[model samples]
Target chain A: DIVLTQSPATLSLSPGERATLSCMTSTDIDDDMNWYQQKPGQAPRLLISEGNTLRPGVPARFSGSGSGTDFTLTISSLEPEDFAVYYCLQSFNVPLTFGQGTKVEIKRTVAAPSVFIFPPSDSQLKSGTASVVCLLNNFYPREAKVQWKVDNALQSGNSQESVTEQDSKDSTYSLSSTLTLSKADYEKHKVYACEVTHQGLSSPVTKSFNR
Target chain B: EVQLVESGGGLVQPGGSLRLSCVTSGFTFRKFGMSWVRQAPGKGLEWVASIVTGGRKTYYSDSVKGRFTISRDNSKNTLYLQMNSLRAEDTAVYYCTRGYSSTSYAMDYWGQGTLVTVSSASTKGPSVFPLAPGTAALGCLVKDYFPEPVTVSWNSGALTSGVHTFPAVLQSSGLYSLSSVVTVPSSSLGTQTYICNVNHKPSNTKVDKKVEPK
Candidate 1:
């Protein structure tokens, strides 16, 4: 097979980043390809089979897409441990040609969370079940844990969450959570907060939404 | 040695025609197939058209099925997308990806994207003014935010819930924008107040707006 069997180059990235690595072949081989992820000192593990079915235990984010002579192994979102070497194999021909493994590395521009809080619309802002929002922006990885507090008491996990988005422009991710508290709490001037706990930060971030 | 390259995209007037091309090289170009897709903030990803290299089979997304036609020139090893009667909404980045069957396999190779704009320009993202982008069960397009991603919620007093939709965020050049819509249920219209809540994730930031029901 025609092989770009070039050595995999060092690819620097941030968490939540999506990467597509190639395992180009010289000729058409139908859809017979596979991808593997190798750790620092461990054997390469099968991530995808024949360039389609993902090995069990692999995150859904890891997938293979492509056909004919050009094949691809894509990580929908990068994980911390995913910072390893990857290789693509074309099983269409004998001798099973392999691509020189590519590397996935992280750059350390870890960003702190940008936070915002919003109250419900004006008509319902002052009363009814108080709908409060706490947004945490652009942080590295998806490990940041979130918590909510009303009047110093931790609220149940009433907040609805959005999928963590890996910034297409950066290796950061963004997600938000909203909590609903009793209207009586608002009437009493109780505090509603959005708190974030991430290993990258010196302290947990807690901001109250009032008014 | 397989590669897909995109070219020929520029400004188009509303109601004008536009042509975009994707060139392929390396490997047997004619034996494999290719398809074209385009995307813009809030408007969503549109499957512009497709073609199989050695066959005449083709497919198109219903929205543009009537105005866009996809063609190929195996002899020249090229895929062509011809769109006519374009509008401001057509302003977007056009992409040509390598794949045969739409499903079953993922897009293995993609040409670099080329941005095309209609002179009028479609709304870029969610706004702070001019009535939050939608009406009659609006489809708001919230654009521009960092910190990874955000969530949009539709709250109905004691029963605040998010509207049914998917992420509309996109990355262009070296930047990214998150766009989403809240299509309110017609049945849940009057009496109850509707709150359009957009929250920035990872910690504490909540932005809100007053949404009038249609």
Candidate 2:
């Protein structure tokens, strides 16, 4: 099995700019390669297969070329959602492996937050005070916050705490926040909603949850 | 609209002979020709042999010229490759690719590979020649190491530290050929004697040669 490595570990680009990722192999794989794009909280989408055949629905702007030891994945004009992660996979032999992912991130620009919400654990929800963790990971500009709402009404006294951590092996930073709700106030309704606000966001990402 | 399909590859024993075939269609099969290619585990692609039009002569990588034969069946639009005196290292995927022309380099179109394994018998030591590297070096060109990916290193009386480099190429016939070079300072050329070491794991063989100035 050939070992694969992706260089420039992370690509920082602005919307509409071009980004090119390199996938190198320790030996020749004979053009038996595949490319995939992954976004937070989503299954990866196949972009190209067999070196040059683009999968259906993928834009022509995304292309893969090269054979043997050196290959590349190029995104001609970067889209906002294109700033997630890209990978090169080889279907050559057994003990299959992938190139360490190349992260497409934003530089000197704001990126929309990738948001997810989780109810407290069964053990934690049984306590006197219950809260949900609203994760706002992988957005540009560290100055983003989580906002809470109850049954369509803006709520206050919500303690929002965040922790910033470098993501994976890349230079990108991902942060998450936890919003605690009084067990009394949280159990009073079947509706809980949250949105993340960042200066880069045209509008906050708001999603409502149910019991 | 040219298509090539390969088959007839399987297990063989040491000192055994095997024949592989590649079927072709959608083009004038006789107007052009095909070359048999292969890739062993952990190695790059290799051109084993070729069967061109006319007199039907076969050209082989020097490493396997004595052991492999290339032929074809014009009636069936098929190409054939045969190898004998197999060793443990003679196991790999066999493919047939479009042959070269004045307009293009060969290997533009390829057949799906057929895997062949020569693991039924014991292995043998490789045919290695030492005279092999450096900014100032010996190039040890190794041939016929079975079940490939042999290791090459530099050894010398006076040189304490050096780097080894191997090119990314494999020779078909289920064997490997590598030119390992070692680089040392040009200023120290005559002060020391060096050796090129080739180790074949399956055969448990270690062969080396002391540097002989050319």
Candidate 3:
């Protein structure tokens, strides 16, 4: 297996700026490398093939260069939607490998969100299982993480989370997270907590519940 | 409007010969190159062979270099794989993928894989060949061992992600050979020591391959 390495783990740039991403291979790979752009929640789209040939649908601004292991992917003028993760892959050898992605992001101020935790209903507590919901409103940048804890233990498995797009008027986002557990835990009077961690917030904002 | 369908793959015995066919449509077959990739029941993808239409160039991996053949019929809009002297370790689902152009390498389209099971399979101690950092990977080539199950780990713990182990390739000597690669950040190079640990079930032994990049 050949190793493909991508540089600038994170690229901070705004619209109209040139973005350059580097990919280095351990061995000489001729022109058998490909580049891909991946946005959040979407499949990666192929941008360049054979090291430098642009794909049919790719914009003219995106280009690639170099050969024999050292390669580069360049965006002449970044668009707003170009703020996404880019990866490089080598098809020259067995065990086709991919580079750790390079993320092109916009450097800007962030807005913290207000957190709300909804208690489980009586039926939900009485049933074999129980569900707790947590909501975050008015967050900017739409990048945040939610964690659920029960009696101080981090809850994992059988949990889900989603972030909604920014509101046109406020330009802020909303997110939700849910955690399910056995009813026996609630019967034992366990405490459940929701923790919100965001770039805007210096520390996590947590809310807890105890039956 | 492009499509790929594969046929002519299934149960084959040791020393048997097989021909797999890939039927393509909605595009000009002579304008692009095609590759044959395969995966065992529980293994990583392996590149078997490829053929380009531009200069009629063909490439093959070391595992199947001599016995495998990759050819296409532009008149029929189809590609074919002719493999001979098959062995049990060759059992896998083979896929025919479309490349961007005769000179480019990208899988724009893929065919539903055809399963080929090479019927009847070893106990030898594993040997490790530690390879240095490949810009971003630490690789270990493990060979001459079997029971078909080997566990790979790093210095700290059992590797879960950023690690790829290719399916064991069968050698003419009746032993198995395979390689595993562990990905590390470029920044982590020169200041870190990466160790590849392999646990061979048949030998009931664990071998370590170490690499410290400079």
Better of 1 and 2 by DockQ: 1
What is the lDDT of every predicted structure here?
A: 0.60, 0.64, 0.73
- Per-residue lDDT tens digits for candidate 3, residues A1-211, read 3778889987867679999999999998878888878664343567988747888978899999988989999999988878877888787755556687787866545789767665555534554655566767667777788888888888776565555433434445666666756677666757889899998889999988675
Output the number of the DockQ-best candidate: 3
- Residue A40 deviation, candidate 1, in Å? 26
For candidate 2, the lDDT comes to 0.64
**Model 1 per-residue lDDT at A187:** 65
Model 3: pairs clashing at backbone N, Cα or C within 3 Å: none
Model 1 alpha-carbon drift over 4 Å, by segment: A1-78, A81-211, B42-46, B100-106, B121-214
* Worst window of 10 by summed lDDT in candidate 2 chain A: A162-171
Question: Distance from true position, residue A22, model 2, in Å?
Answer: 10
For candidate 3, the C-alpha RMSD (Å) to the true structure equals 18.8
Best by TM-score: 3
Candidate 3 wrong stretches, greater than 4 Å:
A38-44, A55-57, A105-107, A121-127, A137-177, B1-23, B35-97, B108-214
For model 1, how does the per-residue alpha-carbon lDDT over B97-195 read when each residue is reduced to its tens digit? 665333322234667777786654333323321122122333233433432345676562333333333353333322233333333455555654666
Better of 1 and 3 by lDDT: 3
Q: Write the per-residue lDDT of candidate 2 for residues A1-211, one digit (tens) a residue.
A: 4788887877777779988899898888778777777664333456887646777788989998887788989889987767877777665543345677787876654666656555544444465656565555445665776778778777676544534333333334454444556677778877777877887778888866786
10 residues in a row with least lDDT, candidate 3 chain B? B130-139
